[PDB]
Write a protein that binds this ligand. Sequence first.
Ligand SMILES: Nc1nc2c(c(=O)[nH]1)N[C@H]1C(S)=C(S)[C@@H](COP(=O)(O)OP(=O)(O)OC[C@H]3O[C@@H](n4cnc5c(=O)[nH]c(N)nc54)[C@H](O)[C@@H]3O)O[C@H]1N2
Ligand SMILES: Nc1nc2c(c(=O)[nH]1)N[C@H]1C(S)=C(S)[C@@H](COP(=O)(O)OP(=O)(O)OC[C@H]3O[C@@H](n4cnc5c(=O)[nH]c(N)nc54)[C@H](O)[C@@H]3O)O[C@H]1N2
Ligand code: SF4
Ligand code: SF4
Ligand code: SF4
Ligand SMILES: [Mo]
Ligand SMILES: [Zn+2]
Ligand SMILES: [Zn+2]
Lengths: 568, 131, 438, 264, 79
Amino acid sequence: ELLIKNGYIFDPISGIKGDKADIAIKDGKIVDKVSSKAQVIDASGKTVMSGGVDIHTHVSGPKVNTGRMMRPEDKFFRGSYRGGIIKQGKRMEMGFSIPSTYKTGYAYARMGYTFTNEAAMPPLLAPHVHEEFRDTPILDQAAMPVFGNNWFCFEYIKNKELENNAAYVAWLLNATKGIGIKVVNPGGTEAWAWGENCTTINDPVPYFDITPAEIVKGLIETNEYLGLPHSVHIHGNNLGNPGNYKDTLDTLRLAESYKAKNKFGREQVLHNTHIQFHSYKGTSWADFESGAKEIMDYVNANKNITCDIGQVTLDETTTMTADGPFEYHLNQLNHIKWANVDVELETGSGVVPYIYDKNIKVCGIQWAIGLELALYAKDLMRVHITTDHPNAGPFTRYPCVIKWLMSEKARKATLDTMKWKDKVIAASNIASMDRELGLYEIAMMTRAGPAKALGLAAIYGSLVKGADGNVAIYNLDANDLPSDPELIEAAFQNTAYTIKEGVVVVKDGEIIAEPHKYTLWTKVNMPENAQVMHDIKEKFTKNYTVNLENYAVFDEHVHNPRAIELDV
Amino acid sequence: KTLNMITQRAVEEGIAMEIGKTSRQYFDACSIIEMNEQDMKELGIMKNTNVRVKSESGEVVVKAVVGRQTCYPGLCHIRQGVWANQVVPPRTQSTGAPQYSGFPVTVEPVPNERLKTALELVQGAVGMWKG
Amino acid sequence: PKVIENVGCPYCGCSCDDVRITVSDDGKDILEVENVCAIGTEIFKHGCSKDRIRLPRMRQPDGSMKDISYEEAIDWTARHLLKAKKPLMYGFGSTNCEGQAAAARVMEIAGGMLDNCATICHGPSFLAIFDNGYPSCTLGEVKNRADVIVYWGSNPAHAHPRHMSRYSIFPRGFFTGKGQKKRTVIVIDPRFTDTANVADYHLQVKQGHDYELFNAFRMVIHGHGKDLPDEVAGIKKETILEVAEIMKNARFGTTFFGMGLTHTDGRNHNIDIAISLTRDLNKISKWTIMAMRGHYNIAGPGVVWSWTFGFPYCLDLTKQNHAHMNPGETSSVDMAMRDEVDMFINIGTDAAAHFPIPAVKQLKKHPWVTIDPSINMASEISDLHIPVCICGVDVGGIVYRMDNVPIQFRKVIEPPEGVMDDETLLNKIADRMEELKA
Amino acid sequence: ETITMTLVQEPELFLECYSVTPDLFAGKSLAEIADLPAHEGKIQWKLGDFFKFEGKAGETAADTKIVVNGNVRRMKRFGQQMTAGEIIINSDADMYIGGWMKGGKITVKGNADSFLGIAMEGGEILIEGDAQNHVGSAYRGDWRGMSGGLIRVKGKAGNDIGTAMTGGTIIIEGDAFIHVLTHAEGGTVIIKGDVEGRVGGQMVKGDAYILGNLLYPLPGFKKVATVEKEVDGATYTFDQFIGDLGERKEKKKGEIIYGNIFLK
Amino acid sequence: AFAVHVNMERCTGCNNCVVACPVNALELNTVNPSSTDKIYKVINGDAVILDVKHELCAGCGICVDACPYDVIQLSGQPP
Ligand SMILES: Nc1nc2c(c(=O)[nH]1)N[C@H]1C(S)=C(S)[C@@H](COP(=O)(O)OP(=O)(O)OC[C@H]3O[C@@H](n4cnc5c(=O)[nH]c(N)nc54)[C@H](O)[C@@H]3O)O[C@H]1N2
Ligand SMILES: Nc1nc2c(c(=O)[nH]1)N[C@H]1C(S)=C(S)[C@@H](COP(=O)(O)OP(=O)(O)OC[C@H]3O[C@@H](n4cnc5c(=O)[nH]c(N)nc54)[C@H](O)[C@@H]3O)O[C@H]1N2
Ligand code: SF4
Ligand code: SF4
Ligand code: SF4
Ligand SMILES: [Mo]
Ligand SMILES: [Zn+2]
Ligand SMILES: [Zn+2]
């Protein structure tokens, strides 16, 4: 139905480096050979990858809508719109940070991305997430229910019932149509409901006397027992404070006794996210330096731990994490707006604007840390690229991240335009670092890393036979990289083409059409537990305002699902 | 005399509107002043008698009763609806929320004058009062 | 005798979904309704009526009102929306969230002003949220944890009837097994309302002085409360100190507010001083402000237009590719005052009844269209009255509670043969407008 | 050196004539100026469809100077983001005059609607009419608003004077209404008449000179001294109040700084 | 075993007489519930007392103290 003739190919899942191969998409799925009726694309001298996969991004949900409400300065500022003015598609694009659903979809399409994994969703608020997903334009999308502060998963990991906790995770996933498990600030977010926080890995939750370590271990056992596609995506504890690299190592040492068992290809057992946030060092903000060296030494050791960076893009942004205490602490630091949304028997929330400006030693070192993490990686397949959008910057700054990685001139420029360059270079190591990640490496840790880690590399993230026909062609030639890094910025910002399951949707960087989208979920098939059925009924009668029969997203409120089924 | 005033809700009022905005229940529920007993005595208002509530942005003839929800001396109250919005001032203070509670008004005991129905009030304000 | 569980009551912010209906044998008569308040009972009793509007109805020259077909009404509205220069679509308090998405699309095509009942109700609150933030919580949180409850300027007994018995006071939660008897309820308003009857304290404040009251509380909290005058806003300093001590010692508090704050002097500054007070209390305790939203899905337009245009209300969609929002300039009442409109579309509200009559007089100079299920004041001074299904009775969908938690409403009656719903209607209007090629 | 604009066709609705600035008029031919864009409702007019031009603009905005001589009392957005030059409105005006301005000066000879000088950053305004509310107020949802310049409302102001103000000065030669200098952080406000009250609420820092009479003083201000101050006048012997003790206070080197409101 | 009378004319369906009755609260809020019968249930918007034969009430006054707009009269004398 389509073929992309004579373009450089970069498929890390097939180990292909700059071959003049031809991809023959045929009815949404890549096939070896298609006849001469297929419309061709002359991609000569253009770098072809697969449709990028994003593993961690908050592009929907109650947090994001609370941010959009709370922050109308975001759209309009100093008279002119910082989101730019454009109506390429059939709708509008509003928002610099936290863009409206129509801007997120179009901006990823122009990026080349095709799958975005909306990380955190409170299970009670699932119709909201599925409604915003119906409105996102082209990207296929899945969301990950949060199970690290659920009361039901505090009972079961207290009382050591792997089977019951597994049945409950399967029930939740089947209700909220999720795709994995996210633990956001294990245990602590619930102590925030009383106003406290779990500052380490060992302290107990109020009234539950379970610890972050116990809950993380229980959820890992549950996950690897059910064989879910994606691992236990983990946030961590003591976020955003100096000296917490020790605690980050303590929480990473929780996987030393598990093996990823599933019918999908993944080598992780847990996925530690925005680690440039967890890799701080020192006592306070005046004796603050980078622990990225130690964090990546541990990760380079362990092969069942995969990561991603939370590189800060050095601009104005709103920070949304499902944990309260970090956002409250940030509000008390900078004296700006703060929004808090506690969920019932489940999670927390927090939205706080923040200025990652260039004129601060703290922000400079924060910028340097993510680069140190990415440039200390011996294996890039395990270390991905996100920005925790928008916690470390909007996704429309991904090409800036890629420029910083791929051109040391860009990093020298930023460090020179930075105000406290002397302090930042003294308290970091990124000034003297030659590594420039290659185009193959960037394709690796942008497309294959996330897909393989999500354990859905069969369909997304690669150009091998049978995969989903999502292709993204770029302007730059692989033979000689551009001299000016702004060329890289533009090349990754605007794609020459972009195909979604066989239908071209972006040309020259201009949206063309929006056929449809899928919303992946997990379909664990297993006999129900009378014990968890009874416990759920009791807990809804006593504790939840909504009803048991109205908690599950109705079969008609999900948008073209395409489940991922399982057994037992 | 200056007699500050507010406009608020009541269950009988909600019940009435969901029976219907053009129903006798709605008429009975909304055409009501709920003022203080001391103020009623001082003004000279017989309980359950029509009275002229006249603010700077209109006028309305409304029954004058005493309410369980004890208004302190110097406060008035109409259950929100047609009659109250005949007299609510439109000032918004550049926020879009008209002065729905807390506008001065003068009260004049005027029995022997009928009450105006909801349709008559609105369709006559617009100029459509066929009946 | 076919009992239907888990229905939604479509009237107040509580979005109660614990309603049981005993529909007739033929599935078109509602016999008995259990577990709902009276205001709701009447909604269902009206929805199950036998004599209800079925076709649109146009204003003839004579002043009477005769029926027309749906296609003719859609043609009329489409042509007028395109011919106008700045139409205004108002309402959306009582509609599903698909009804508030379809409307956004329609007015994106048109180019007019799109707005909801937020402007005249809790929009002053949003304007404060923009200033200070919204430290809030879901309602199960106060059901299961709240130790102190403050109803500042609100009247749940008459506004939201089963609010107290469902979310705030009387339910015995998890950490509040003792029920009411360990909850301290403080009610502030000049009247001695039924909420104050049920309450345990009462701060009878002079109407309009809530800003001074909040400032007094916050000076107490910040610590040097000895600098208060003898009395503040009519409240006496010792009572102020009493309530402030209770608030400080609260294990988990929660503040609710309403028209007492959003409809008086300093519309949004009252709300933002309240939010500042909450943010200050979270220094030593846990406190969560929360707005007493009125209609079921009045938080639905907020979220839907947040994800669509980024602005909850007062949308300036006239540039056709960038939207604007400034409540003092783009709101329905201010535009009606400064005759800045060209067409008013009544969708899911009663503008004629519930607007000030000067604004209604100013608006009626232009054409006027109403999309309501039943007769009301707007449908009596409109030019054509298009019927539509009722959310939660004839058609289901998502609605958004007081705290932005999506409830899924169910359908209990099939709508009368011929009547469509707003998402189908707004979509047909948008299709016809694109056919007219604008 | 100058441009003359005279309204010839009356617009039935409000014209968002944001394009009328020295920045857009500088160094342009008369036909070009007459065809600069201007919106009305959902239609876009050409700005020659409502005005008649007679003059010669300069090579630079700092040179040019516009004079509007008609009933421009339903025209909004005049002076938006004006960097330098001059505007005169020989009538009254509507919303957003001088919004986000960075220099120059606007001499409205009549009234003004809301949002005058929104987020201004320099320059002058010389209204002689009754400006409405939100004079100098920051845009909805912002924390750093007006940061320089001068506003001189020679009539009755309204609500939300100097909201979230950061620097500069708002002088109201008449009187005011509720909510002066809320959320503020710096600058002055010189009200010369009766104020209903609620002045200085939420203030973190700043000054609010008042020469009229506060009728509702907020509890958050306490008298600490009686000082003589020459503000826009001469020695008026003010009795300053100190800070909004309700709201947290920024601390300087070895001293907490309060937002001191003065009085007559 | 007393007798409670609910003035249907001013009952709003608030359901705070159902939630607050300590005999209603026996079923779901007790360890090993003893009796699962209920005095009030709000049918058609007004509180109906299922306790027709006056066997379960205990004259507690939690329900009279609960109704916001007094509408429940408690009779302490034999019916
Ligand atoms: N039956 C019925 N129920 C309804 C409605 C209805 O119309 N009828 N409307 C629904 C909708 S649209 C709304 S928004 C909600 C809102 O309803 P609510 O937000 O709960 O507010 P109200 O019911 O109007 O009562 C507000 C209380 O604040 C008091 N008050 C007035 N001025 C002041 C003041 O200056 N200071 C203080 N501290 N208090 C003051 C008033 O006396 C009143 O007691 O109710 C909803 N529920
Ligand atoms: N004097 C005074 N007036 C006020 C106020 C005040 O405080 N004092 N408050 C103001 C405020 S808070 C607002 S909310 C208004 C509230 O007033 P409104 O927002 O106007 O509320 P209702 O009048 O009940 O509107 C209900 C109408 O929508 C219809 N409807 C129900 N479901 C649907 C649906 O699914 N689709 C469509 N298309 N229609 C449906 C209903 O049949 C009914 O016609 O009152 C305002 N007026
Ligand atoms: S409180 Fe509101 S939603 Fe609940 S039953 Fe009553 S009217 Fe319906
Ligand atoms: S008196 Fe006590 S036991 Fe009797 S009905 Fe009332 S609450 Fe129940
Ligand atoms: S508490 Fe009172 S008003 Fe509420 S249902 Fe019971 S008797 Fe009726
Ligand atoms: Mo409302
Ligand atoms: Zn995180
Ligand atoms: Zn995240």
